[PDB]
Paper text:
At present, the best structurally characterized pLGIC is the [name] [name] ([name]), of prokaryotic origin. Each subunit consists of an extracellular domain (ECD), predominantly in a β-sandwich fold, and a transmembrane domain (TMD) composed of four helices, labeled M1–M4. However, the [name] is a pH-gated channel, activated by lowering the pH, with a maximal activation at pH 4 and a pH50 around 5. We instead found that proton activation is a complex multiple loci mechanism, with the key contribution stemming from the coupling interface between the extracellular and transmembrane domain, with E35 acting as a key proton-sensing residue.
The β9-β10-loop (Loop C) was investigated in conjunction with R133 (Loop B), both of which are located on the principal (+) intersubunit interface, a region that contributes to neurotransmitter binding in eukaryotic pLGICs. In contrast, mutating only the three acidic residues (E177Q-D178N-E181Q) produced a marked decrease in pH50, whereas the individual Asp/Glu residue mutations show Wt-like responses with E181Q having a tendency to decrease the pH50. The mutations E177A and [name] were previously reported in a cinnamic acid study with pH50 values of 5.4 ± 0.1 and 5.6 ± 0.1, respectively, as compared to a Wt value of 5.2 ± 0.1. The decrease in proton sensitivity following neutralization of the E177/D178/E181 cluster, which is completely negated and reversed with the neutralization of the basic R133, K183, and R179 residues, as well as the importance of R179 mutations alone, suggests a role in gating rather than in proton sensing. A structural analysis was performed on E26Q, E26A, E35Q, E35A, E67A, E75A, E82Q, E82A, D86A, D88N, D88A, H127N, [name], and H277Q mutants, by solving their structure at pH 4. All structures were in the apparently open conformation. There are no significant differences, measured as 5-fold over Wt, seen in the backbone Cα residues of any of the resolved structures, with the exception of E35A and E82Q.
Numbering used by the authors:
A (entry chain E), B (entry chain A), C (entry chain B), D (entry chain C), E (entry chain D): 5 to 315
The structure:
Amino acid sequence: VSPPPPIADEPLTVNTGIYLIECYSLDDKAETFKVNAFLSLSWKDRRLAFDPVRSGVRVKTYEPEAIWIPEIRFVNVENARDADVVDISVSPDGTVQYLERFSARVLSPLDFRRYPFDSQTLHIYLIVRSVDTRNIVLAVDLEKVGKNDDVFLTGWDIESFTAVVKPANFALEDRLASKLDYQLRISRQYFSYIPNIILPMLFILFISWTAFWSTSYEANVTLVVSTLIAHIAFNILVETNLPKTPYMTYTGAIIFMIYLFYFVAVIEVTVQHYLKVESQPARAASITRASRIAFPVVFLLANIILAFLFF
Amino acid sequence: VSPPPPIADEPLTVNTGIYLIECYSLDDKAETFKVNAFLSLSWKDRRLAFDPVRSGVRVKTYEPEAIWIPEIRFVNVENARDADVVDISVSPDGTVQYLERFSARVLSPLDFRRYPFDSQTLHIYLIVRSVDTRNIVLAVDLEKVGKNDDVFLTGWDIESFTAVVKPANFALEDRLASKLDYQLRISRQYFSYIPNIILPMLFILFISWTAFWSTSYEANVTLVVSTLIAHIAFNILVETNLPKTPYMTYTGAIIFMIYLFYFVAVIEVTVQHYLKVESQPARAASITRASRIAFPVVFLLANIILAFLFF
Amino acid sequence: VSPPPPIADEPLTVNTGIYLIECYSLDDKAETFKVNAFLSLSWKDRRLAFDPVRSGVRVKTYEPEAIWIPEIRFVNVENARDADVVDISVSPDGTVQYLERFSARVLSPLDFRRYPFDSQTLHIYLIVRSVDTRNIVLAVDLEKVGKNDDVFLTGWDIESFTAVVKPANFALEDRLASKLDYQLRISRQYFSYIPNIILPMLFILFISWTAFWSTSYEANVTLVVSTLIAHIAFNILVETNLPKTPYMTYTGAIIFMIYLFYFVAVIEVTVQHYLKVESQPARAASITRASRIAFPVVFLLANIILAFLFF
Amino acid sequence: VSPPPPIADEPLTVNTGIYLIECYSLDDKAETFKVNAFLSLSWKDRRLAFDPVRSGVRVKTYEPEAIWIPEIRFVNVENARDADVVDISVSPDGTVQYLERFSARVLSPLDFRRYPFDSQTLHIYLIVRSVDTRNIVLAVDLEKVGKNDDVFLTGWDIESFTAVVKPANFALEDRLASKLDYQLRISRQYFSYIPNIILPMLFILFISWTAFWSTSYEANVTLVVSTLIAHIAFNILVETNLPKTPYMTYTGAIIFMIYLFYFVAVIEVTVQHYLKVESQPARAASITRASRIAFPVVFLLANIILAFLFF
Amino acid sequence: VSPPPPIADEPLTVNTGIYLIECYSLDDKAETFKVNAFLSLSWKDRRLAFDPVRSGVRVKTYEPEAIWIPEIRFVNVENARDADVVDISVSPDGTVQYLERFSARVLSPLDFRRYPFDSQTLHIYLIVRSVDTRNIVLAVDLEKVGKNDDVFLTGWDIESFTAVVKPANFALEDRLASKLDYQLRISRQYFSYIPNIILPMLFILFISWTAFWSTSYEANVTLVVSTLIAHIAFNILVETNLPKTPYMTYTGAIIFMIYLFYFVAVIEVTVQHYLKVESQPARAASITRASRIAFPVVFLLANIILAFLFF
Ligand SMILES: [Cl-]
Ligand SMILES: [Cl-]
Ligand SMILES: [Cl-]
Ligand SMILES: [Cl-]
Ligand SMILES: [Cl-]
Ligand SMILES: [Cl-]
Ligand SMILES: [Cl-]
Ligand code: NA
Ligand code: NA
Ligand code: NA
Ligand code: NA
Ligand code: NA
Ligand code: NA
């Protein structure tokens, strides 16, 4: 079969629409998500036109084999989409109405800078390669673009599913290509991070600061070192749920900065002991008393500075 | 092939039934379960009707290819179901009796609020899209809905497998869709959680409270800090078997609250030491003696309050 | 094609046999195992009968497509078996001799009560659904049931592979079904558990009891708490290699009971210190001296009781 | 199609050869490896013979469908090999030269007794089932057996890829079978184990022995218990990279024996303290001084004994 | 179909080109990466030549089935590439222009010596086996070799995608083979390693050195042993993200060397205590004072030596 012939030198417009049925498995480490949707296509093939009076019928169904169907592909999919044709319906003027149900693992990158208080724009790119007979251009039929109400992405809030109506027309391997951008806007559900990582991590830090109200070196060493190990466990736990970024994430920055606080606490604990042993407990007392105010104040200000730079 | 023609303007009723053979792999993190069942369909196609006297046979078998079969799909499946046709049998009046065996990874969400003392309702949604010739409506043949006695879901108790007999009729891509709800009611086997997580977690907490019967700061610091680390391990172990929820789970609440008890224990231990050093052991004694009653009582009451709010 | 016609009202007997080639991947958590075997089938189709004098040949070979082959399925498989036909041979009387080589992930449940000193019976269920023309019944040709000598199931000892010769004939979706039970009896290789989990776990417990020969509270607290943490790690390690059971496993019981020994050791350590501080070292001495005999004796008796209840 | 006819009662010899392109994914836990190779087959079919003068051509190509090809299968593969026919070429005498490119997950067992200083022989078993017309026997065409120079198996050294030229001819499901053994000899690259597991494990043990030069019970308890926990971590890390064996591995034995050294160290530390407290520091001194020589000497001799038994 | 006939004895040149669409999943442990690209092929088949005047058309499209297409395979792929033909276009002279879109898991080895400051050259090997009719040789059409601007490999920087224009012509199973080398040059994004592994690891080491400003054996033992355990966790964490190499990696060397620093710190701590107890605090003071300079200086120089040897 060949593509529909042009009336003049005009390109063939294939109207598109994606309707999400099931949205699932957003892998932060892999920067992928799985989708299960409907793909609707519509174009005019004058060769298929018929008289509704003579033929009796208002629409004619066809099997994919019987007629010409444009080769529509997804750009950012991992492997080729699994698709099954739901319906093909031709109206008297020759307007074809194609529908298929597909599933695909889509590869759209993520920005972890404000993690876990981040929002993402997932992309689904539809493309079409022009044939030698005639050039093919994509379009968005807006009322065939949507999502099911049940659509739930675990640990995320689905904000919107829209399409950038103007296609990106460009050259690809010496032929015209018409690319379309479907955008799924989502925002992370940060709530769980607070009682599971943030608050436990702050509690262990504050426990390390009880060493500023203790003269026992043996006890202080235990307090600051033990809590430092628990902070290492939280750093490891966090960096497992995330990929290796060439930038600093919000949680990454806080976690890093907290190490400096543990390091300075070890210095103070060591200085206090050295001074007490050196028979200078007056000077050691001054340092310990100062640290009680310095550590919380510097921690609070440094966090104001970080939140400011990141948000 | 085309759909059966209507006697009048009535829709075509496709009677359905699902019979579970094997039920397995309930992923709490993914909110999926795997199923292996029979799907039975029945509708009347007058075009297939025959005289049993003239034809000799009481029923005629057909291959899927030969006749019209309604396109029935599952809504909440991950990928398209793996199905194999067992039998297609037509009675003299034209009543088709279709049977297929399928397997699918079903995506039904879970409510972890009462975890691990939770009960779930897993869903299997059957759907059918109306064609241009005539509208298709789903029905439940209750005699063809069931499950095998051997059906076992590891770590869960299977309560019931029933169907909501009235379908959800709605518009989908400008055509009528008839959705059916098959519900598998299950309840978690919480038994293992008691000797593996709950009792070990309470034992380490009670061990931390032996610091209220000790004047040794070095020993208390070791007792409260060491047991706090074991509690961190249990928090990490628990949050691995579960997904990130935008709400507080029952175990999540208990685990969180227990951190506060460790934090207050560190404060008491620090206060006792400061006072003893400051030559005020009488005041330190009062605080330590009070804590012995306060900590268990506040723990017991806070748990009564939590169990009340969650159940 | 249609099934062979009956001489009288007799059912069609399909003789079966399974010969295991490779047996592997027994997942304790999933209660599945993978199998690679031969499935042999034999039935008489008088329609295929031929004169060996006239046809030249003593046997005729056919492609699956050419003749009627009974639809034999496995009940407890995860997804549909991967099968490849090795041979189909028809003798002059019409006796068909079918051979296929298949691979499948079989879902047979396990009893972890005596873990890791448990024995299992894995099941492979063959089934056949009767057609409208005539009823089909399964049989076991014992000469075609076996296993290769090389058959090795990692971490398990293969005892026997036999078949329950009498099929389970029952109604399934309003038609007769003939089910057959192939049983693979295996027993766990418990050896590795002894130097990797059991002996390391006993060593750490006995180390905790060296606190009954020490008056140093600071040292005792370190001894009992540190070893309790190592026991937590062993409990976690063990519960990872196993699924969540609604019953107590043998190792589960020992692991649980050992927590009580750690808890009572903390009590003794605390009592000894309180008494020594309260200027009652005579009473503290009596308790410590008693514990030295009590702890090993109670541990030994409790283990005799457990081994008795479980075996 | 039927197999080639015999001149007399001789069997048909199918000459074989495997040439490895890519060798990868040796799973120690699963005892599997993945292979990507060429399979070459050659046999004489007199029916295909032709006169090169009359036909013009020196060789004739055929599609698998056109001619008879022996059913060659792999015994120890997991699932059926993925194969694609590269070429089929017939010489004037009727000698067929078949070539296919395949990939398979091969299941060959491993001997971890000398781990990580072990060498393995991976097996690829080719088999052929005799037909009723005539018996089929396998052979090795040695210059069609090889491997690519680039062939690399991560963490292993590939020594040789050869075939046991004499096939194993035996009865299988009442027909003759010709099995061939292709052996891939490999040896583990033990280098990484030394700086990552062996030396770190010895360092922590030697650190525990610094307790023989200390009279501080509190410090000794910390030294021996802390290092014992690090040894537990190494035991866990090692047993994860390996399957559960019914025998003792080399590393397994060393790891186990090291626990006894920790146990005896705890005993010595306890005895020293009891004696010092009991006002017998002279006797405690003798034991501590002896342990300084005993522990390293017994460790060194026990290791000589182990290396001897294992190598 | 047969290959194009030669004008004279010349070989057939198949011009190639790979254009990367999506590049993802670089597994360091497995030494694999997944690719999703276009494969373009071009060769002259005089049999397909046509007169553009008589035929009307300037180019003719063909289905893969209709014409002869060279069997091009990838050497270092895991399983056979997933490919879908985009276009086949013939010009009047008979020049065929083939285009297909494929996805494959490519197995290219990696050099971890400078990890995580390493650069890699990933390979994609295209090959072609000569037929009996005529020899086939590969070529690189440089205008049809490229990559998309959006091409992103998570945690890596894509430097270049080029091809070694001269093919490797060699014998394979007694026939000529033409191999082509496509090289994807990438360099690791080491940034994340600094705040997550390197700086945390140095902080814990420096904390261990605060024992040179302390006379408390009990505190020193806690300081050096606790920090040694955190270093063990970092060694384990690092060796999980990497495969077992027969050489020393950069991070591997630093990690190993740091163990020696912990071991010598334990010796110093032990010596200081023994001497103080032996009533030689003057000598213990000299050693402790020296260690304060020795440890940082030796650490800094040893690191200069390592960086020099590795870079
Ligand atoms: Cl696609
Ligand atoms: Cl479906
Ligand atoms: Cl609606
Ligand atoms: Cl409608
Ligand atoms: Cl099956
Ligand atoms: Cl095979
Ligand atoms: Cl390929
Ligand atoms: Na088409
Ligand atoms: Na149909
Ligand atoms: Na058949
Ligand atoms: Na054939
Ligand atoms: Na301590
Ligand atoms: Na072709």
